[PDB]
Amino acid sequence: SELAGHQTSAESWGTGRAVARIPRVRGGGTHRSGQGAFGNMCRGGRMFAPTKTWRRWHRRVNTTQKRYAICSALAASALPALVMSKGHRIEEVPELPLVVEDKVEGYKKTKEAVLLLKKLKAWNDIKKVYASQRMRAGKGKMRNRRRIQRRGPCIIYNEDNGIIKAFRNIPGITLLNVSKLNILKLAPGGHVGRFCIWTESAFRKLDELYGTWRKAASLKSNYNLPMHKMINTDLSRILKSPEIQRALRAPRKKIHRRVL
Amino acid sequence: APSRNGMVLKPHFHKDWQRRVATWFNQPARKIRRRKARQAKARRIAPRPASGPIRPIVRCPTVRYHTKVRAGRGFSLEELRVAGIHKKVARTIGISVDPRRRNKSTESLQANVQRLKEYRSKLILFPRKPSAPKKGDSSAEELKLATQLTGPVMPVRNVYKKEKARVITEEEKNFKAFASLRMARANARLFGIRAKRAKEAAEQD
Amino acid sequence: MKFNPFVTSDRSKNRKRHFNAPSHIRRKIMSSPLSKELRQKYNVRSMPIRKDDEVQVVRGHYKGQQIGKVVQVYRKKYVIYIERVQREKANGTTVHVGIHPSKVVITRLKLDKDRKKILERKAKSRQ
RNA sequence: CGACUCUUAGCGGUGGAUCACUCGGCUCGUGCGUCGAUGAAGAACGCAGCUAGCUGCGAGAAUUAAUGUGAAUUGCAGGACACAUUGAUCAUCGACACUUCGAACGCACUUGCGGCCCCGGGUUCCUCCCGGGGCUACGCCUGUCUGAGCGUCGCUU
RNA sequence: GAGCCUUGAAGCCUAGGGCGCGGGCCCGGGUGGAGCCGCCGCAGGUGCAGAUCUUGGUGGUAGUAGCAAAUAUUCAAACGAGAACUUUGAAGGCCGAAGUGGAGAAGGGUUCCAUGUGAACAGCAGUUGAACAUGGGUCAGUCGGUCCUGAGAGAUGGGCG
RNA sequence: UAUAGGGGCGAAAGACUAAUCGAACCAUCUAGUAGCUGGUUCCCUCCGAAGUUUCCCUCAGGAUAGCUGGCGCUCUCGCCC
RNA sequence: CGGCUACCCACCCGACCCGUCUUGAAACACGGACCAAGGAGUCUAACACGUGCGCGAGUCGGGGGCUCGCACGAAAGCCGCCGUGGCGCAAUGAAGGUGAAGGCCGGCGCGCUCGCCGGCCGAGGUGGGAUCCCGAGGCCUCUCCAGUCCGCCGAGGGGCACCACCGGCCCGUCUCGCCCGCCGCGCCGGGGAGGUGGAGCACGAGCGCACGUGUUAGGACCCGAAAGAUGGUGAACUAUG
RNA sequence: CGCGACCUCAGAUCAGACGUGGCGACCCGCUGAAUUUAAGCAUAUUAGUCAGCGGAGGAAAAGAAACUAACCAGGAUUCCCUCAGUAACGGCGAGUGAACAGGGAAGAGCCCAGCGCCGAAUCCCCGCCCCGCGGGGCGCGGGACAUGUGGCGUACGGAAGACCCGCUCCCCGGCGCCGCUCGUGGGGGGCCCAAGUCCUUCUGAUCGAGGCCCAGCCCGUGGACGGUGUGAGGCCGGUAGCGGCCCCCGGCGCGCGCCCGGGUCUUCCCGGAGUCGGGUUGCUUGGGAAUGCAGCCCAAAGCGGGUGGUAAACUCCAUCUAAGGCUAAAUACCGGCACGAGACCGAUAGUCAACAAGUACCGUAAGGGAAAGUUGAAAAGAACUUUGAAGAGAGAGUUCAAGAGGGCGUGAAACCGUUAAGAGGUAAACGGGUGGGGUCCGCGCAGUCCGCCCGGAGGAUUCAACCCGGCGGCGGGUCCGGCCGUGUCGGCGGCCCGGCGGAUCUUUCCCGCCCCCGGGGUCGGCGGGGGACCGUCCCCCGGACCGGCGACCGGCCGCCGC
Ligand SMILES: [Mg+2]
Ligand SMILES: [Mg+2]
Ligand SMILES: [Mg+2]
Ligand SMILES: [Mg+2]
Ligand SMILES: [Mg+2]
Ligand SMILES: [Mg+2]
Ligand SMILES: [Mg+2]
Ligand SMILES: [Mg+2]
Ligand SMILES: [Mg+2]
Ligand SMILES: [Mg+2]
Ligand SMILES: [Mg+2]
Ligand SMILES: [Mg+2]
Ligand SMILES: [Mg+2]
Ligand SMILES: [Mg+2]
Ligand SMILES: [Mg+2]
Ligand SMILES: [Mg+2]
Ligand SMILES: [Mg+2]
Ligand SMILES: [Mg+2]
Ligand SMILES: [Mg+2]
Ligand SMILES: [Mg+2]
Ligand SMILES: [Mg+2]
Ligand SMILES: [Mg+2]
Ligand SMILES: [Mg+2]
Ligand SMILES: [Mg+2]
Ligand SMILES: [Mg+2]
Ligand SMILES: [Mg+2]
Ligand SMILES: [Mg+2]
Ligand SMILES: [Mg+2]
Ligand SMILES: [Mg+2]
Ligand SMILES: [Mg+2]
Ligand SMILES: [Mg+2]
Ligand SMILES: [Mg+2]
Ligand SMILES: [Mg+2]
Ligand SMILES: [Mg+2]
Ligand SMILES: [Mg+2]
Ligand SMILES: [Mg+2]
Ligand SMILES: [Mg+2]
Ligand SMILES: [Mg+2]
Ligand SMILES: [Mg+2]
Ligand SMILES: [Mg+2]
Ligand SMILES: [Mg+2]
Ligand SMILES: [Mg+2]
Ligand SMILES: [Mg+2]
Ligand SMILES: [Mg+2]
Ligand SMILES: [Mg+2]
Ligand SMILES: [Mg+2]
Ligand SMILES: [Mg+2]
Ligand SMILES: [Mg+2]
Ligand SMILES: [Mg+2]
Ligand SMILES: [Mg+2]
Ligand SMILES: [Mg+2]
Ligand SMILES: [Mg+2]
Ligand SMILES: [Mg+2]
Ligand SMILES: [Mg+2]
Ligand SMILES: [Mg+2]
Ligand SMILES: [Mg+2]
Ligand SMILES: [Mg+2]
Ligand SMILES: [Mg+2]
Ligand SMILES: [Mg+2]
Ligand SMILES: [Mg+2]
Ligand SMILES: [Mg+2]
Ligand SMILES: [Mg+2]
Ligand SMILES: [Mg+2]
Ligand SMILES: [Mg+2]
Ligand SMILES: [Mg+2]
Ligand SMILES: [Mg+2]
Ligand SMILES: [Mg+2]
Ligand SMILES: [Mg+2]
Ligand SMILES: [Mg+2]
Ligand SMILES: [Mg+2]
Ligand SMILES: [Mg+2]
Ligand SMILES: [Mg+2]
Ligand SMILES: [Mg+2]
Ligand SMILES: [Mg+2]
Ligand SMILES: [Mg+2]
Ligand SMILES: [Mg+2]
Ligand SMILES: [Mg+2]
Ligand SMILES: [Mg+2]
Ligand SMILES: [Mg+2]
Ligand SMILES: [Mg+2]
Ligand SMILES: [Mg+2]
Ligand SMILES: [Mg+2]
Ligand SMILES: [Mg+2]
Ligand SMILES: [Mg+2]
Ligand SMILES: [Mg+2]
Ligand SMILES: [Mg+2]
Ligand SMILES: [Mg+2]
Ligand SMILES: [Mg+2]
């Protein structure tokens, strides 16, 4: 707001002239003189709790939790069930996360990019974004955002040689870098498991940039991989293992209902 | 107005703090401005390095921070005279000159003099006319670079003395006990009163 | 995608500049596509329209095979008027029909020295 | 049987709530650093063919000249329709112009009363004679001109 | 959600059908013409019966009170679709020179005058007006301002700040 | 024409000072403060008081304790004691 | 034919008009003519507690820097010889200052209401204490034999979390006593045994993030005054020259 | 008595030039309250702020120590994080509240008065010439300023003068032109890709499916806008160290104008005064035995003065040189000119103002201050007939729609009219229970239930029952044929043809150095480089385990469509 509704000078009547105890703008001739002054319940009045510029907008996150969320999103982008349950079309798509050659990053014409997506069968995932490019619902069409454009695949690379030019005007695609991994692009809307397309140098630089549980990361100084809570976590295998079923009471499936 | 068990608070908000609120919404703006300022400096000014003048090895005056080291301001005119060059000639070479800095330590004196000798060794200059004073041929293909980053000779140089191996020794371990500190403290607290009693003993004959 | 920060993707500012643009900007806004034989013969995609251009209408209430000549170009209303396209009032008086110039296929252009210079700049910039 | 009163539904009348749109605000950030005595901000008055306001202009008054673009502005009659003459409109505007009051400046301001210089006609000339042009506020800085001093001194009656 | 649709979205009405105890919701029928919703997370200027609540509109009162300070109107004719009110003749009255008369200072600013209309305003009405639209009207050596001082207000010199 | 707000003027009534005068009007501080009136916006389920001790320039108020709700933790039983 | 139903009507019974101040409201207590829209616990800072997450005796980049000029990019990624710094790992004193390990065995000085030497263990003991371990014994279609098998248990032992007590160590005062050391023998320091006060130690659990509740300062749940100050405008009404 | 010179002065409409006022968001200087809190109110807090007054610039202010510190010392000013809600102030109540370090942003230093030396070698003005395009600036001749003091050399970091040594020869301001520059320097004009193709509805389409086995076409251009509605291609525009022209600014390169620093020795010079400080008094501060400022009085020193957080005396030590001045940087900006974006509002909201808004209007005045968006795609704004004097109406007509007819999108509630139904003495209205009437819904009303098995009656088909031909999977065994997973030794093999870390080493290694007697001594000390050993990854064959989501092939039993 930053400029008050208190521009109108006003006083209250009091006991006599029994209209109200609210302040009233004072004058004559103009029929506003005698109406509601500043206040929340009045016409043209200052709002309750005027929104201020010193609200606590921006929120700091721990860097360990940032890297934890990046590792969790990249781990959830590997399972087929998670990405299919997020909604990418992985029917005719070959093996999970796709590793393309180093001749991909040197593309300049995007016809070769469209041909690459058609040969790698991500063209169905692009065609879903073509089929859903509808108009924004609500009053959000006034502030320059009139398109519902769903997110498709993302291609993560290093050593840019024209790959942003080749992948710049495809609907639904996402520009993303190895050294700059974005949580807002790897898992938009807080939903894990986005379909991603990797390169050879990217897929080899991941092991250099995070490491295994034996060694540390060689690019990040003070980072290690998280502790794994349940190592062999197949609960059906555990509950159907003979070591657990050796020490069970009995299958008790009697009901013992109410007897009249 | 107060309540259950909590800390007594005295907030300094009685003054009209609503008018004077400065919130850094232009913090990435200043970041981009100062990036452009540094890059425009490296473009327009010279092949002189960033943070142009060289800073000295300097100790911090405290009982707290004197164990560490610091990049100072200037090269302390006695030190510059021992290095043997003129003042403004040094300022044009790239030597930072501060006339106020004194010299109490011969160790810091010789350290800054050797730092000046290393800087004079690393110096490569190019005058306009090809009469060649203090130069020669294409020295290292115009010295292989254009602009250094964050100090020319790494001005921290935190020296690390180790003294790793020595044998357990004679009765220093039997003489350097806790009582030496208390005896020195008592001697420093009673130094002058013993002198007054000695003067009174000389007075009373 | 918009990359230059000196131009708006802003709806209010674009509509403001559009409905309050001066006449030399409105001439560039009121531009019409060309027929396939004329673009094959001249190698040019779009041209502004003038008083003596022959016009085939492609969309609206009247469509196709109506190669007529325009008479008036209201840049205040963003409307050209065509001599062939008529409509009677209640009192039997004819009046022209509002046709937006972006739904207009030009079949013949008026030749002028300035238009030859314009066509030369079009062909040189298209290269 | 009707009249009057009440409750639902249809339609009609006052009403402009909700919904849809926004040439409008609000916030944040970047870029620049710019008023006047060579007349600032502001105000009064005037200007269009038909023109009250806003907008734009100052007796050259809905704009002048020039550059760029290139066939119009428009609600209506007119007017240039010329473009192998000079070219309508629009934007830029760097050249001209910018009534009066206003720091406002000849005085206070009642559009009054003057005072100098020059130019045109009026008894061919001042002598409180018509029109036009220029000058005429305060303080102060540097320099020029004049003179006041029983402030100090030289030469002389 | 390969969601919904100009073969009809939001909104609104509805003696329709139904669900949930409830907050509410879905579908049927009609006006409407361009945007809307379900789930998962996120953030609110997030739910009204009151505050002599603010703004806007509308009832009972109610076709009620009231159109009554200053003696008073009447006949005929005319313009007019239309006259208790406009105009003229005539009759009777009032103001009766300290006026309900003839002109001014201040104040109003076109209200002054002519033509035309009578929705609008005149508390009924109009053919009428100070309403509306159009077009006109203020001519000075000798009327006044301009000149002068009055009570006073005021700048320079000066002083104070 | 002169006297302009804690000032003016007053044959004195505290009367007048632009419908306001026992301190004018307009704007700002200012959204002044109030232990004091009024109001405070969807549903369902579960639990559920007090008007009492002591202290306070305290008696229309507040602090403390009591009453209450929520969040849990430590254990105990299910198989002559 | 059937139908509950925001439709209408009748009949029997019950039924005072809502909201609040109050011990007490339908009140001869107050607000409310009706209807549509707006309208009242928000936000910042600080603290405390609870909860969830990451790292964990460490934690945190919020302050800057690095990337090529990118709409979303005022985002995000990285620094590590950028950890300066905040909080915590150490408290007690007004302060000079001082500052948290003891226990067992053998020897000696008269094992003296008494200090030293050599070796070993290492955050003490008591009563409870979830859990855990050992186990007499018993029991599975006929005999000796057996291994896992069905299968509990009197009694015994080691004892998390915490509870209650005792003892121990650190600092400041108080009481009583003897000894040791000399970069210098002094109104120099240190040590011993008891009783005390401390927000202490007695194997440390913090830091950052986010949400919820409560308090405080900010206009702060919304509206409300008699009043005060600052600077200007009025003698066209009235009062007096 | 007169003339002349200097000094104090006045005069002018003398020649030339300067200040007034506005804006005031940021900045500088003065002074300046109270509401509020302390639950009361005086000190205090609000606050050295609101208001008032004076000024300038894109920044301003500050800025080269009369500083901080007290130890192994730092070193102009400014801004951020910490210091820190700490030291401290306060009816020690409420509350108020710094600084030095340290890490970062940026970093540029200097000059004059005095002391002296140069014959005033200095500056302003007038007149003509040398001179160039878009204009005023070096040199020639005489009128002033100035010796009561111009300029050169100088500034507390020392400076100057005279010999000795050894080299250097030098720059700042103009003017014509060549290639550029990090966005490919600044601004403006105008231009730059690709469907408008057949069917279908619709008033209109930008709707709906498709364009051969190469995905109809473009993309460095699928941002946005208008277009009869929802578009990347239809149009401005969007991407591009995309492409052309004009204008301006910078650094390269011919003339003109000026041009001796460093080290040793000797001699000389060496500083800012009603100012500091003291007494006293007001305001302010965290500053207390007085932090700063100011009024009055007293009022300096030269081995001096100030500071060293408790007043004073004696003594020692550290640091600085005050009473003269300039300077960009990081910082601020709710005023202005242009620009972009939004988890914000959407005509009772958002600025008071989306619109002829500071407008209408009110008050004498300061001042107060509104209401008010929407026809349709296009006006095609209803020709004409008829009633009435007209307002208005009935026909006809336009449009997809007058159910959009001039405040005209959508059109609710309160209120009113009419129609239809029902009812009416306990004012109306309500809850429980039914009954009657009416609208509407679903269904066929003495005929409506289905899915499976079997015994019966006709037609039409081919598997299945068993096997051959074939692909794909399930399951385990020889872990056979080879990969890979976990630990173990080994070749230390990539240790020199390896990655990272170690206040663990090697003074018999090297370089830059110091010490003792050009050389010797590890005789001892520092930095950097080489490698010795430790803690994880890269190979291999040999072995162990799992063949575990790590699976290929062969064989086996059992599925499978054709
Ligand atoms: Mg305000
Ligand atoms: Mg106000
Ligand atoms: Mg508002
Ligand atoms: Mg909506
Ligand atoms: Mg409480
Ligand atoms: Mg306040
Ligand atoms: Mg906008
Ligand atoms: Mg012209
Ligand atoms: Mg004149
Ligand atoms: Mg519409
Ligand atoms: Mg819903
Ligand atoms: Mg609200
Ligand atoms: Mg909102
Ligand atoms: Mg309401
Ligand atoms: Mg209520
Ligand atoms: Mg009310
Ligand atoms: Mg009302
Ligand atoms: Mg209205
Ligand atoms: Mg009424
Ligand atoms: Mg009556
Ligand atoms: Mg009357
Ligand atoms: Mg008649
Ligand atoms: Mg007649
Ligand atoms: Mg009458
Ligand atoms: Mg008559
Ligand atoms: Mg009279
Ligand atoms: Mg008249
Ligand atoms: Mg009337
Ligand atoms: Mg008439
Ligand atoms: Mg009139
Ligand atoms: Mg006459
Ligand atoms: Mg006269
Ligand atoms: Mg005066
Ligand atoms: Mg004076
Ligand atoms: Mg009296
Ligand atoms: Mg009295
Ligand atoms: Mg009065
Ligand atoms: Mg009073
Ligand atoms: Mg007063
Ligand atoms: Mg309030
Ligand atoms: Mg108030
Ligand atoms: Mg009491
Ligand atoms: Mg009460
Ligand atoms: Mg309590
Ligand atoms: Mg409890
Ligand atoms: Mg409980
Ligand atoms: Mg009660
Ligand atoms: Mg009572
Ligand atoms: Mg009640
Ligand atoms: Mg009463
Ligand atoms: Mg009531
Ligand atoms: Mg009432
Ligand atoms: Mg509401
Ligand atoms: Mg917590
Ligand atoms: Mg630290
Ligand atoms: Mg008071
Ligand atoms: Mg005053
Ligand atoms: Mg008078
Ligand atoms: Mg009187
Ligand atoms: Mg000024
Ligand atoms: Mg109070
Ligand atoms: Mg009070
Ligand atoms: Mg104060
Ligand atoms: Mg102010
Ligand atoms: Mg300026
Ligand atoms: Mg200065
Ligand atoms: Mg100095
Ligand atoms: Mg702290
Ligand atoms: Mg004090
Ligand atoms: Mg306090
Ligand atoms: Mg203060
Ligand atoms: Mg569009
Ligand atoms: Mg589009
Ligand atoms: Mg195009
Ligand atoms: Mg001294
Ligand atoms: Mg002294
Ligand atoms: Mg001294
Ligand atoms: Mg001392
Ligand atoms: Mg002291
Ligand atoms: Mg100075
Ligand atoms: Mg600055
Ligand atoms: Mg509306
Ligand atoms: Mg309004
Ligand atoms: Mg329209
Ligand atoms: Mg329709
Ligand atoms: Mg409508
Ligand atoms: Mg409609
Ligand atoms: Mg009836």
Contact in structure between A142 and A158 (CB atoms under 8 Å): no
Residue C94: phi and psi, rounded to 5, are: -75, 155
Contact in structure between A195 and A101 (CB atoms under 8 Å): no
How far is C107 from C65, CA to CA, in rounded Å?
Answer: 11
Q: Which A residues between 7 and 66 have a beta carbon under 7 A from any strand G atom?
A: 12, 14, 21-23, 38-42, 47-50, 52, 54-56, 59-66
Cβ atoms within 10 Å of A208's Cβ, excluding its own? 11
Report the Cα B166 to chain-centroid distance in Å.
32
In chain C, residues with a C-beta closer than 8 Å to the C-beta of A168 are 1
Distance B19 CA to H52 C1' (A): 21
Q: Answer yes or no: is A216 CB < 7 A from strand G.
A: no
DSSP-assigned states of every residue in A217-238 = -SSSTT--PPPPS-SS--HHHH
Interface test with A, best of B23, B24, B27 (most A CBs within 10 A): B23
**Amino acid letter at A9?**
S
Which subunits have 3 or more CB–CB pairs within 8 Å of chain B?
A
- CA Rg value for chain B: 29
**Exposed, middle or buried, B75 (CB in 10 Å: 0-12/13-18/19+)?**
buried
**Amino acid letter at B203?**
E
Q: Do C9 and A168 touch (CB under 8 A)?
A: no
- CA Rg value for chain A: 31
The two tokens of residue A165 are 């030019």
Q: Answer yes or no: is A23 CB < 7 A from strand E.
A: no
How far is C85 from C95, CA to CA, in rounded Å?
Answer: 9
Length of chain A: 260
Q: Read off the DSSP letter of residue A177.
A: E
Resolution in A: 3.6
Residue B186: phi and psi, rounded to 5, are: -65, -35
Residue B5: phi and psi, rounded to 5, are: -60, 105
Q: Within 13 Å of residue B37, how many CA atoms lie on the same side as its CB?
A: 7
Contact in structure between B81 and B180 (CB atoms under 8 Å): no
**Exposed, middle or buried, A200 (CB in 10 Å: 0-12/13-18/19+)?**
middle
Residues B96-125: b if buried by 16+ CB within 10 A, e if exposed: bbeeebeeeeeebeebbbebbeebeeeeee
All residues at 6 or more sequence positions from A203 whose CB lies less than 8 Å from its CB, including other chains:
A97, A99
Cβ atoms within 10 Å of C98's Cβ, excluding its own? 14
What stretch of H or E contains A11?
strand A10-12
Distance C60 CA to G30 C1' (A): 71
> Which technique?
cryo-EM
How far is B30 from A215, CA to CA, in rounded Å?
Answer: 39
CA dihedral A34, A38, A40, A43 (to 10 degrees): 40
Contact in structure between C70 and C83 (CB atoms under 8 Å): yes
How far is A227 from B29, CA to CA, in rounded Å?
Answer: 40
Secondary structure (H, E, C), chain B: CCCCCCCCCCCCCCCCCCCCCCCCCCHHHHHHHHHHHHHHHHHHCCCCCCCCCECCEECCCCCCCCCCCEECCCCCCHHHHHHCCCHHHHHHHCECCCCCCCCCCHHHHHHHHHHHHHHHHHCCCCCCCCCCCCCCCCCHHHHCCCCCCCCCCCCCCCCCCCCCCCCCCCCCCCCCCCHHHHHHHHHHHCHHHHHHHHHHHHHCC
